[PDB]
């Protein structure tokens, strides 16, 4: 009906698939752009059975992109770090088509315009800032989503729940706060804000009050959930910093990210600005899965671990 048509790049991705599923659940005609040689064949079949329109192609196909843009209203990019500047290909098509009502670039993490990180990671988020500046320069309607930490991703990373080891690594003092959200919810809320006028040309942050915690508190709550105690092994902050200067790329990137999220506490180091929009306050019919509910999911049916591409 009146539902805006949504085009998603990287829809077969770790976070992208939750955006495709959320879009279809909400009744939006959904277009998924995917490479001709992608191995996400079974996933695409699932998307298709759910009503998605699959479009195979390369980002280098400028004409194809423009013709596709003319058929949709909203564009969401969930491309990975290695492809951040390749989003300029998407932006160029958006500009030529001229009918796009909202563009959401691939942010979905820290709020890069108000925080800084160690060189390995700083260089990467600067690429995301470059996309934002180009969007603003061209007056393209947008929504910048700071999703904070992907919960399943980092619960797996920090707790290694599938590992019967008796020790757990703690980065720094472990007292830094961070916010983490369930991937499925990040996907659903992202589709919602993409058409919500309250999110037009604004920074939307996902920071539900039930999802703020420290490494030490997460470990304590997990121990209670499974009835086991762990020996906490700390890696001093000055030690983490050294690694980012010697460990080569891409090995030093994850380390730099860990420092940003869990030592500097970048997702919780600032107060909201006048024009910021915290998403959990937007829809009374919805709510973010809480940390306790997340731990229950890991007890009953834990999702597999993942490693981002760098
Ligand atoms: N906040 C957090 O905790 C985290 C944030 N992130 C962020 O989420 C966003 C997406 O990350 P993530 O979901 O891990 O991305 P993925 O690594 O899952 O990649 C997304 C999609 O990109 C497409 N793709 C891969 N390589 C290429 C290429 N060479 N050319 C064109 N398309 C390509 C693939 O789709 P196909 O095969 O269909 O072409 C792929 O499924 C990023 O901005 C990332 O920084 C990610 C992890 C954690």
Residue numbers in the entry: 5 to 314
From the manuscript:
The basil EGS and petunia IGS are closely related to a number of other NADPH-dependent enzymes that act on phenylpropanoid-derived substrates. Structurally, the PIP-family proteins organize around an N-terminal, Rossman-fold domain, containing a core, six-stranded parallel β-sheet flanked on each face by an α-helical layer. In summary, a mechanistic scheme emerges in which binding of the coniferyl acetate substrate within the active site of EGS leads to deprotonation of the p-hydroxy group (PUSH) coupled with expulsion of acetate ion from the C1 substituent (PULL).
The structures of EGS complexed with NADP+ or NADPH provide the first structural characterization of nicotinamide-cofactor binding by the PIP family of enzymes (previous crystallographic analyses had yielded only apo-enzyme structures). Structural differences between the NADP+ and NADPH complexes of EGS are small, and center around the nicotinamide ring of the cofactor. The nicotinamide forms a planar group in the oxidized state, but is distorted slightly to a more boat-like conformation in the reduced state. The nicotinamide ring adopts the anti conformation with its B-face stacked against the side chain of Phe154 and its A-face directed towards the substrate-binding pocket. In contrast, the anti-conformer of the nicotinamide ring observed in EGS is consistent with the class-A reductase (donation of the pro-R hydride) activity of the PIP-family enzymes.
